[PDB]
Every structure is written in structure tokens, then in C-alpha cells.
From Swiss-Prot:
It is found in: Cell outer membrane. Transmembrane segments: none annotated. The chain holds residues 224 to 329 of 769 of the full protein. The gene is pilQ. This is Type IV pilus biogenesis and competence protein PilQ. Required for type IV pilus biogenesis and competence. Could function as a pore for exit of the pilus but also as a channel for entry of heme and antimicrobial agents and uptake of transforming DNA. Present in outer membrane vesicle formulations which are used as vaccines in human. The lineage of its organism: Bacteria, Pseudomonadati, Pseudomonadota, Betaproteobacteria, Neisseriales. Disulfide bonds: none annotated. Homododecamer. Tetramer of trimer. It comes from the Bacteria. Belongs to the bacterial secretin family. PilQ subfamily.
């Protein structure tokens, strides 16, 4: 019943599906919640600040000063709920204090230091950062 048909039905005939593929293997990450920091020592009196910036894939702005280190994670907004300071005084490291400071739209790391020290910044994955503060021994 009709004239010529195919008026709104061209005639694409399917023959099954391609949907079965399980896109996934791993969970997502390891410390994958939201932006956070950690402090530890490694080797010999080195102050290691670990940084977990979830949703930041690139490199922060690290400012190396003798007084302190300033990392700025541009366009990474740290919740004030995650901003914590680690006093870490007398850990026998060149780090005097670790401070995760939320900035307006950025995240700022304030890693207070003193004297001569050495900064080795590491990225373990896009989002997981690490700052190894060695004492520059003279």
C-alpha cells in the first residue's frame, strides 16, 4: 500500500551490533580523588613533597627561591577543603614547611625552604607530581 515508498526510509539495513567492547581495564588511578599533597624523606635528608593534582595534565609553574618554592598549577582550582599545611619542622630536611594553598583559580604550592637546597621535580603521571628537595651540601 503506497506509491513508491522510501519517502523517509532510504533502506539502511543493519546486520547486528558492534557493541560488546568493554572500554576499560584499570580503575582510573591510585590517589585519584582530588588535589592533595604529601611529605616524606628519601635517601638522605631530602624533603620530598608529593603532589596529586587530579585533572592537571601538564607542568606547573615552579618558582625556585631560597626562601620557598612556589608552584602554581594554572587553571587548577584547589578546594580549600584540601588545602593543608604540613609543619614538618625538625624533620632534618631543607623543607621548613609545606603548604598547599588554594589560589583563586589556581593551586599554589608553597614549600618553605632555607639555605642551599636542590629541587628535583618529577611527574609520575599527568596529575601526579613530586618535588624532591635535597640539601645542597657545601
Amino acid at each position: 500500500m503506497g506509491s513508491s515508498h522510501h519517502h523517509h526510509h532510504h533502506g539502511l539495513v543493519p546486520r547486528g551490533s558492534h557493541m560488546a567492547s568493554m572500554t576499560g581495564g584499570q580503575q582510573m588511578g591510585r590517589g585519584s580523588k582530588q588535589t592533595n599533597i604529601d611529605f616524606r624523606k628519601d635517601g638522605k635528608n631530602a624533603g620530598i613533597i608529593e603532589l596529586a593534582a587530579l585533572g592537571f595534565a601538564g607542568q606547573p609553574d615552579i618558582s625556585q627561591q631560597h626562601d620557598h618554592i612556589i608552584v602554581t598549577l594554572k587553571n587548577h582550582t584547589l578546594p580549600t577543603t584540601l588545602q593543608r599545611s604540613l609543619d614538618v619542622a625538625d624533620f632534618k630536611t631543607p623543607v621548613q614547611k609545606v603548604t598547599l594553598k588554594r589560589l583563586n583559580n589556581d593551586t599554589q604550592l608553597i614549600i618553605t625552604t632555607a639555605g642551599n637546597w636542590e629541587l628535583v621535580n618529577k611527574s609520575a603521571a599527568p596529575g601526579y607530581f613530586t618535588f624532591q628537595v635535597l640539601p645542597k651540601k657545601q
